[PDB]
Design an enzyme around this catalytic site. Sequence first.
Site, PDB file in Angstrom:
ATOM      1  N   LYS A  39       6.210  -1.472  16.733  1.00 47.07           N
ATOM      2  CA  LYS A  39       7.084  -1.621  15.949  1.00 47.07           C
ATOM      3  C   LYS A  39       7.366  -3.143  15.655  1.00 47.07           C
ATOM      4  O   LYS A  39       8.377  -3.549  16.619  1.00 47.07           O
ATOM      5  CB  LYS A  39       8.324  -0.766  16.087  1.00 47.07           C
ATOM      6  N   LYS A  50      11.010   2.691   1.890  1.00 41.27           N
ATOM      7  CA  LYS A  50      11.147   4.284   1.678  1.00 41.27           C
ATOM      8  C   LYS A  50      12.476   4.448   2.265  1.00 41.27           C
ATOM      9  O   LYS A  50      13.181   3.931   3.103  1.00 41.27           O
ATOM     10  CB  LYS A  50      10.101   4.926   2.664  1.00 41.27           C
ATOM     11  N   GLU A  90       6.319   9.288  -0.848  1.00 42.84           N
ATOM     12  CA  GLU A  90       7.635   8.668  -0.891  1.00 42.84           C
ATOM     13  C   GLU A  90       8.019   7.467  -0.476  1.00 42.84           C
ATOM     14  O   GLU A  90       9.154   6.879   0.315  1.00 42.84           O
ATOM     15  CB  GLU A  90       8.476   9.986   0.085  1.00 42.84           C
ATOM     16  N   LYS A 122       8.743  -0.472   5.818  1.00 42.25           N
ATOM     17  CA  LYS A 122       8.474   0.732   4.870  1.00 42.25           C
ATOM     18  C   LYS A 122       9.433   0.511   3.979  1.00 42.25           C
ATOM     19  O   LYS A 122      10.601   0.029   4.060  1.00 42.25           O
ATOM     20  CB  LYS A 122       9.170   1.719   5.976  1.00 42.25           C
ATOM     21  N   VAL A 163      -0.312   7.286  19.468  1.00 38.89           N
ATOM     22  CA  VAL A 163       0.299   7.590  20.920  1.00 38.89           C
ATOM     23  C   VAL A 163      -0.800   7.575  22.031  1.00 38.89           C
ATOM     24  O   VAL A 163      -0.423   8.138  23.333  1.00 38.89           O
ATOM     25  CB  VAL A 163       1.187   8.712  20.602  1.00 38.89           C
ATOM     26  N   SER A 164      -2.065   7.115  21.734  1.00 36.20           N
ATOM     27  CA  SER A 164      -3.274   7.268  22.534  1.00 36.20           C
ATOM     28  C   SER A 164      -3.518   8.357  23.144  1.00 36.20           C
ATOM     29  O   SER A 164      -4.117   8.661  24.391  1.00 36.20           O
ATOM     30  CB  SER A 164      -2.803   5.968  23.715  1.00 36.20           C
ATOM     31  N   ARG A 190      -1.853   9.179  11.743  1.00 38.38           N
ATOM     32  CA  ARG A 190      -2.571   7.858  11.915  1.00 38.38           C
ATOM     33  C   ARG A 190      -3.738   8.181  12.858  1.00 38.38           C
ATOM     34  O   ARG A 190      -3.588   8.675  14.310  1.00 38.38           O
ATOM     35  CB  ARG A 190      -1.282   7.094  12.578  1.00 38.38           C
ATOM     36  N   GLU A 200       0.810  -1.428  -0.042  1.00 33.51           N
ATOM     37  CA  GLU A 200       0.041  -0.100   0.046  1.00 33.51           C
ATOM     38  C   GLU A 200       0.855   1.248  -0.253  1.00 33.51           C
ATOM     39  O   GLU A 200       2.047   1.055   0.189  1.00 33.51           O
ATOM     40  CB  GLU A 200      -1.113   0.076   1.344  1.00 33.51           C
ATOM     41  N   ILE A 201       0.440   2.401  -0.343  1.00 36.01           N
ATOM     42  CA  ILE A 201       1.151   3.545  -0.263  1.00 36.01           C
ATOM     43  C   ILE A 201       1.221   3.778   1.143  1.00 36.01           C
ATOM     44  O   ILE A 201       0.489   3.601   1.932  1.00 36.01           O
ATOM     45  CB  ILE A 201       0.168   4.763  -0.824  1.00 36.01           C
ATOM     46  N   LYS A 202       2.437   4.559   1.397  1.00 32.74           N
ATOM     47  CA  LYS A 202       2.581   4.824   2.977  1.00 32.74           C
ATOM     48  C   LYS A 202       2.174   6.407   2.771  1.00 32.74           C
ATOM     49  O   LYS A 202       2.836   7.220   2.319  1.00 32.74           O
ATOM     50  CB  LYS A 202       4.136   4.650   2.970  1.00 32.74           C
TER      51      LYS A 202
HETATM   52  N1  LIG Z   1      -0.543   2.422   4.214  1.00 31.92           N
HETATM   53  C1  LIG Z   1      -0.083   2.238   5.567  1.00 31.92           C
HETATM   54  N2  LIG Z   1      -0.101   1.036   6.254  1.00 31.92           N
HETATM   55  C2  LIG Z   1       0.445   1.146   7.434  1.00 31.92           C
HETATM   56  N3  LIG Z   1       1.261   2.271   8.108  1.00 31.92           N
HETATM   57  C3  LIG Z   1       1.053   3.260   7.475  1.00 31.92           C
HETATM   58  C4  LIG Z   1       0.489   3.329   6.282  1.00 31.92           C
HETATM   59  N4  LIG Z   1       0.593   4.689   5.754  1.00 31.92           N
HETATM   60  C5  LIG Z   1       1.175   5.294   6.575  1.00 31.92           C
HETATM   61  N5  LIG Z   1       1.635   4.518   7.737  1.00 31.92           N
HETATM   62  C6  LIG Z   1       2.293   5.040   8.913  1.00 31.92           C
HETATM   63  O1  LIG Z   1       3.907   4.793   8.864  1.00 31.92           O
HETATM   64  C7  LIG Z   1       3.936   4.454  10.351  1.00 31.92           C
HETATM   65  C8  LIG Z   1       5.233   3.845  10.490  1.00 31.92           C
HETATM   66  O2  LIG Z   1       6.115   4.465   9.918  1.00 31.92           O
HETATM   67  P1  LIG Z   1       7.236   5.209  10.864  1.00 31.92           P
HETATM   68  O3  LIG Z   1       7.838   4.654  11.803  1.00 31.92           O
HETATM   69  O4  LIG Z   1       8.390   5.834  10.025  1.00 31.92           O
HETATM   70  O5  LIG Z   1       6.589   6.656  11.339  1.00 31.92           O
HETATM   71  P2  LIG Z   1       6.344   7.837  10.723  1.00 31.92           P
HETATM   72  O6  LIG Z   1       5.142   8.565  11.074  1.00 31.92           O
HETATM   73  O7  LIG Z   1       6.101   7.718   9.047  1.00 31.92           O
HETATM   74  O8  LIG Z   1       7.741   8.870  10.825  1.00 31.92           O
HETATM   75  P3  LIG Z   1       8.042   9.325  12.254  1.00 31.92           P
HETATM   76  O9  LIG Z   1       8.094   8.290  13.208  1.00 31.92           O
HETATM   77  O10 LIG Z   1       9.710   9.484  12.278  1.00 31.92           O
HETATM   78  O11 LIG Z   1       7.873  10.588  13.097  1.00 31.92           O
HETATM   79  C9  LIG Z   1       2.695   4.338  11.077  1.00 31.92           C
HETATM   80  O12 LIG Z   1       2.525   4.926  12.636  1.00 31.92           O
HETATM   81  C10 LIG Z   1       1.621   5.068  10.425  1.00 31.92           C
HETATM   82  O13 LIG Z   1       1.237   6.372  10.811  1.00 31.92           O
END
Ligand SMILES: Nc1ncnc2c1ncn2[C@@H]1O[C@H](COP(=O)(O)OP(=O)(O)OP(=O)(O)O)[C@@H](O)[C@H]1O
Length: 332
Positions: free
Chosen positions: A223, A231, A208, A229, A55-56, A38, A31-33
Site C-alpha cells: 500500500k 472512492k 463506485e 483510490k 495475498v500470494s 485481483r 482508470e476504473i476501480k
Molecule cells: N484499475 C485498478 N488499478 C489498480 N488497482 C485496482 C484497480 N481496479 C481495482 N483495483 C484494486 O483496488 C485495490 C486497492 O484498494 P483497496 O485497498 O481498498 O482494497 P479493496 O480490494 O478494494 O477492498 P478491501 O481491502 O477492504 O478488502 C487492489 O488490491 C485491487 O485489487
Amino acid sequence: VNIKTNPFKAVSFVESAIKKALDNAGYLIAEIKYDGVRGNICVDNTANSYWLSRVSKTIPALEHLNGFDVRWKRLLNDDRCFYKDGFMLDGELMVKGVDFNTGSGLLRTKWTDTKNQEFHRKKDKVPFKLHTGHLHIKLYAILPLHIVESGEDCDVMTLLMQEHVKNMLPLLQEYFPEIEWQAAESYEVYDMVELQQLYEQKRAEGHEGLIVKDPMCIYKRGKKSGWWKMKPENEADGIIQGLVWGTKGLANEGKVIGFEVLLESGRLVNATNISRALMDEFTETVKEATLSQWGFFDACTINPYDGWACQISYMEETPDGSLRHPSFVMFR
Ligand SMILES: Nc1ncnc2c1ncn2[C@@H]1O[C@H](COP(=O)(O)OP(=O)(O)OP(=O)(O)O)[C@@H](O)[C@H]1O
C-alpha cells in the site's frame, strides 16, 4: 519471500497529493476501480503458471489453470515477449454474466455451483473449476518475475507500464484465446475539474470509483502513495431533508441526483454522486408522491424521504469540517 507477489495497493484519496502529481506530471492517469478479485498470474521460465491473489494464495475457481502448459513456453520464446525470465500479470479477474460479488464468490469457491468447466445435478463434494469462458480479465501491470521475487519496486513508471501491458496483450490473446484478456480503461485528465467530471461520470455508471495513478510513479510494492483510490471510503450520518435535483443549466441530469443531508455537527452536505439507477429510482418515488397533486414540479414537491435518517460517504475532510466529494450510501 516465497512468492510474496505483494502488489501495489492504492492509498486513499488525498487531494493535496494528487494535485502535486498533476502539477509535476502535466496530467493524471485515471482508470476504473474494478470490483473483482485481483489476480497476480506468475508464469516462470519452467512454463508454469500460478493464478495467485494479492495475498500470494492461489484462487480456488482458477487453481485448475496452474502448473505447466506448453503455450507458456511458446509465448516466452516469442520475439514480442520481453520477459523471458517469466513474468507476473497484475489485474482484475471478473466473471461474465454475474454481477460483482457473485463473480468474486464464484472465484473463491471450491465445491460446485455451476458456471463450470465440465461442461462447455451436482450435489456434494466436487472441486469447482471456473470455466475460462466466464473469466474476463483487465490488466493494469506486468512485472519481470525476479523483481516480484526480490520484493523490489519495479522501475517502470505508469505511462510505460501501459505500453508493456498493451504489448503483452496480443501474445496472451494469441496463445490463450480461452480467456478474455484486456487492458483496464484509462483516461488522461489535465485538471482537477476533469478528474471530478470523470469520477462522477463513472459513479453514474454504477462503478463506485477510480484509481488515480501518478503517471510518473513507478510500480511500488504494497500500500503506497502514487496510486490513489478516488472512492468514498469515509462513511457517515445525518437525516435527509431535501432533494438535490440535477443541473438543467448545463448537464446530463434533469431529475434527482441525491439528498440534502443534515450532519450531526450542523453541516448541510449535498450527498450526491450516485449511480443513475438510484437517481431514476428516487425520481419515480418523488414523481408519484407528488402526483397526489398531479403536477409534479398552494402546492410543492412531496419528497417521500424528508426526515429519513441516512448514511452518506465522503472522500476526505477539510479543516473547517468540509467533507470532500460526498455521496449517498444507504438510509439508516
Ligand atoms: N484499475 C485498478 N488499478 C489498480 N488497482 C485496482 C484497480 N481496479 C481495482 N483495483 C484494486 O483496488 C485495490 C486497492 O484498494 P483497496 O485497498 O481498498 O482494497 P479493496 O480490494 O478494494 O477492498 P478491501 O481491502 O477492504 O478488502 C487492489 O488490491 C485491487 O485489487
